[PDB]
Amino acid sequence: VVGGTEAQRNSWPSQISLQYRSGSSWAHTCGGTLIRQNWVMTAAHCVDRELTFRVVVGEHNLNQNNGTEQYVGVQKIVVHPYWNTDDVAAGYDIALLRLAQSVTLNSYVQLGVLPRAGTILANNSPCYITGWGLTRTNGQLAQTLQQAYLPTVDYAICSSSSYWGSTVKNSMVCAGGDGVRSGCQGDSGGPLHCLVNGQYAVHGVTSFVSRLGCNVTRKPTVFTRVSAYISWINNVIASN
């Protein structure tokens, strides 16, 4: 997250860190959202490489024991059928990970609230992006969870030629674009939390930023719109 501030410990308890084994250790590659005790939602581009993955819930500092972490293996990866690695601008950047076991819920570990199907937010709705990704374009990962206030940019503005044009589809949510605050590499897969009816719900899965830079004026961060995928998500959980 560029232009973020540090989050409080139990502020975003559905946030997970998706990690892969790197030699002897484990490195953070992506965020995600805990949606069931044994299911995690993330971006499909996070699992394009065939690596050994684990999920960490109840995480706050990547490099220090917090006394709250649970570490569990990924047993099955279900990527959306239409995902195409060579065309992220086509959409379908979503994947569901079945965990090797059920995590224990507590004040640090809670399920993410999904929106009802078809829900579109109005322009400039209040949303927060969260993650441990790069804090500057070509910088380094955050050690502690960051958050940034990232209000939405509706589809008619986001797909206008001065913003992303044709590259954004209506199956995506755009948030930010002020040139200060954005998602950045390593925030991929994570939540965009938006306040709707007094409740924060996860409306986005972080998908891409400009190749020119993470915080670029009129290139808001782009998210998979979770409300476009509610039937697919429920059909995978109920059949697997």
Ligand SMILES: CC(C)C[C@H](NC(=O)C(F)(F)F)C(=O)N[N@@+](C)(CC(=O)Nc1ccc(C(C)C)cc1)Cc1ccccc1
């Ligand atoms: C791996 C891809 C699928 C998504 C990748 N995701 C992220 O970094 C995210 F923001 F979500 F956390 C991204 O935007 N990667 N970039 C590598 C940018 C990139 O390639 N983005 C991109 C944008 C649009 C498209 C469409 C037009 C095909 C493809 C890739 C990040 C970047 C940002 C600033 C400076 C340098 C690098």
Ligand SMILES: [Ca+2]
């Ligand atoms: Ca830790």
